[PDB]
């Protein structure tokens, strides 16, 4: 009854949005093209023209739908995306490295971790999850009822998502993969009481031995190829009675746990990057990628050396919900011990086999060739900004995220000589079923500033005043976005609504200023985690980056991605420049006190 108190995703006035469309375009589009769009936009919102008609459409799709963007966005952003899920869609995660140093401690943690998730599922199933606030308003809790007991499925034209959460016989098992081979594992009793760590460990220690030796083909690596190939590949794969049951089990699992194998260690300066890679894609076809099932919503991956993290399917939800589970889980892995009562009678786990054929032999060999190419093209850099975090920005009466978003503009600008189309994920969870909207960090005050900075003709006194203007201009966008007052989503709405009506694709969308404004060189998001962890994901375009960070109190975890295919990008360099951009801004703010 909480999802009925929340307001529905509004529709910003056509004039209002189309206005912010112009304002935000100036700094990234020619003074020529902007003039064009200017005339085009006036024509669009003419009283009695196309725009006014389509606007009436969205203003109706709301009265006959909980959320007028739900289906469109999910379908548009993920389900129709025919590229692989790996690196392009499913965000990895790096968690605080555990201390165990042997094949029994590795299993020990897995158990402790598994018990934590179920302890969290309780609040979900029991619907006793605490109300999350995005300032002074309640947040949509839906996303929490989609991440567990679900999985994505390959469709020849569009993909589907199976959810076994609230079904007749809610699964009580999970998936475990060791040496490329899957195993089922129940964590509940015919009495309702969950399995304590002990049982789960003995169940995990039993699953453990059953797959001591590796030799089988990594069928699971089939979920990392193109979505048109896996669709056909998956289609054949389930033509066997056992096969189908095998995949059917994984798609019911409350989630998956991967016990990855050894990998030739590298230096420590490039360590963090070797793990992030091991958490996002798997590190080749001859390492750990086969110890996965990327279609599965939640995959918790525990390494050998002690490294650990995850990788989830984005369709389900955004990083927040996922990390508001990571925090609780890592918490459980640390807390004390209670009743370690004797091992009740526990059954043996079911080994999920995969009848390997010559038809599937090729798809398995064609997958390796693909994945191995996506990787040799991924360039990632992990930056731990110790200099400061939320502390400083806050002490300057300035918003931390805005301040961090102005530094990226400066850093980027300090590399290409121009501003670019920038994206910052903004959650609209203060609305029922809502997901996210766009916060464009590339603005008028943003460009003026990055230029007023490196301009040796502008005094440090006018510099700081240009910095502050930007930080708050961005904050206003942030505040306007999270309140359904942005424009990117509304914009995509008029476009899709236009298609539906069966009308001529508006010129506005066919506009140059459009192919640009949607081309994001900087794809970013913030995912605060009460735990010292970092999230990451490739770039949205070939010529750009992927940037996600965790703003703490005394520091910031930063991830930076890029493709080697594009010589115009280098993750380390952007990382190396952002670091200098934040330190620089601080030197300018501490030199000229606005007060005191
Ligand atoms: C847009 C968004 C990132 C802004 O978050 P935010 O926390 O408000 O950002 P801020 O910079 O304000 O950081 C908040 C902290 O700075 C403080 N702050 C903000 N403005 C301030 C100011 N002017 N002076 C001093 N402190 C300020 C806040 O009080 C808060 O303090 P706290 O540490 O006690 O929490 C967030 O609302 C959002 O929408 N996140 C979406 C994440 C997501 O979905 N990601 C998907 C990834 S796949």
Swiss-Prot record:
It holds the Pfam family Carn_acyltransf. (R)-carnitine binds at residues 423, 425, 436. Its EC number is 2.3.1.137, 2.3.1.7. It is found in: Endoplasmic reticulum; Peroxisome; Mitochondrion inner membrane. It catalyses: (R)-carnitine + acetyl-CoA = O-acetyl-(R)-carnitine + CoA; propanoyl-CoA + (R)-carnitine = O-propanoyl-(R)-carnitine + CoA; butanoyl-CoA + (R)-carnitine = O-butanoyl-(R)-carnitine + CoA; hexanoyl-CoA + (R)-carnitine = O-hexanoyl-(R)-carnitine + CoA. GO terms for cellular component: endoplasmic reticulum; mitochondrial inner membrane; mitochondrion; peroxisome. It is an enzyme of class 2 (transferase). The modification N6-acetyllysine is found at residues 232, 239. It comes from the Eukaryota. Monomer. This is Carnitine O-acetyltransferase. It comes from Mus musculus (Mouse). The lineage of its organism: Eukaryota, Metazoa, Chordata, Craniata, Vertebrata. The gene is Crat.
């Amino acid at each position: 009854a909480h999802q009925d108190a929340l307001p529905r995703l509004p529709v910003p006035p056509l004039q209002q949005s189309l206005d912010y469309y112009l304002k935000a375009l100036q700094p990234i589009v020619s003074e020529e093209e902007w003039a064009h769009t200017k005339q085009l936009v006036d024509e669009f919102q003419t009283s009695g023209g196309v725009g006014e008609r389509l606007q009436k459409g969205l203003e109706r799709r709301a009265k006959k739908m909980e959320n007028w963007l739900s289906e469109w966005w999910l379908k548009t952003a993920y389900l129709q995306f025919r590229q692989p899920v790996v690196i392009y869609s499913s965000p990895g995660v790096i968690l605080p490295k555990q201390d165990f140093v042997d094949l029994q401690g590795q299993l020990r943690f897995a158990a402790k971790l598994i018990e934590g998730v179920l302890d969290f599922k309780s609040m979900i199933d029991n619907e006793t999850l605490p109300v999350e606030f995005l300032g002074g308003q309640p947040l949509c809790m839906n996303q929490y009822y989609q991440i567990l007991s679900s999985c994505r499925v390959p469709g020849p034209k569009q993909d589907s998502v199976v959810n076994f959460l609230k079904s007749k016989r809610p699964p009580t098992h999970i998936t475990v993969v060791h040496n490329y081979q899957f195993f089922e594992l129940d964590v509940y009793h015919s009495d309702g009481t969950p399995l304590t760590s002990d049982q789960i460990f003995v169940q995990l220690e039993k699953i453990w031995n059953s797959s001591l030796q590796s030799n089988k083909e990594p069928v699971g690596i089939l979920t990392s190829n193109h979505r048109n190939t896996w669709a056909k590949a998956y289609n054949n794969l389930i033509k066997d009675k056992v096969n189908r049951e095998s995949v059917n089990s994984i798609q019911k699992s409350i989630f998956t746990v991967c016990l990855d194998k050894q990998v030739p260690r590298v230096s420590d300066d490039v360590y963090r990057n070797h793990v992030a890679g091991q958490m996002l894609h798997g590190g080749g076809s001859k390492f750990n990628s086969g110890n996965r099932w990327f279609d599965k919503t939640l995959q918790f991956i525990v390494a050998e050396d002690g490294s650990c993290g995850m990788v989830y399917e984005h369709a389900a939800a955004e990083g927040p919900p996922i990390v508001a589970l990571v925090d609780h889980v890592m918490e459980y892995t640390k807390k004390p011990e209670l009743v370690r009562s004797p091992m009740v009678p526990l059954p043996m786990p079911k080994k999920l086999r995969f009848n390997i054929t010559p038809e599937i032999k090729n798809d398995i060999e064609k997958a390796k060739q693909n994945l191995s190419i996506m990787i040799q093209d991924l360039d990632i850099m992990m930056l731990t900004f110790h200099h400061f975090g939320k502390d400083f920005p806050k002490s300057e009466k300035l918003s931390p995220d805005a301040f961090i978003q102005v530094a990226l503009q400066l850093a980027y600008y300090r590399i290409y000589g121009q501003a670019c189309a920038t994206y910052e994920s903004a959650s609209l969870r203060m609305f029922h079923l809502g997901r996210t909207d766009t916060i464009r960090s590339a603005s008028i005050d943003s460009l003026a500033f990055v230029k007023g900075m490196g301009d040796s003709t502008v005094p440090e006194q006018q510099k700081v005043e240009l910095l502050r203007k930007a930080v708050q201009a961005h904050r206003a966008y942030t505040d306007r976005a999270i309140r359904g007052e942005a424009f990117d989503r509304h914009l995509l709405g008029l476009k899709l609504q236009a298609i539906e009506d069966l009308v001529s694709m508006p010129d506005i969308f066919m506009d140059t200023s459009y192919a640009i404004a949607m081309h994001f060189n900087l794809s970013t998001s913030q995912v605060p985690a009460k735990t010292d962890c970092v999230m990451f994901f490739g770039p949205v375009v070939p010529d750009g980056y992927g940037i996600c960070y965790n703003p703490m109190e005394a520091h910031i975890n930063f991830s930076v991605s890029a493709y080697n295919s594009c010589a115009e990008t280098n993750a380390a360099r952007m990382a190396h420049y952002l670091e200098k951009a934040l330190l620089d801004m601080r030197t300018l703010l501490q030199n000229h006190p606005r007060a005191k």
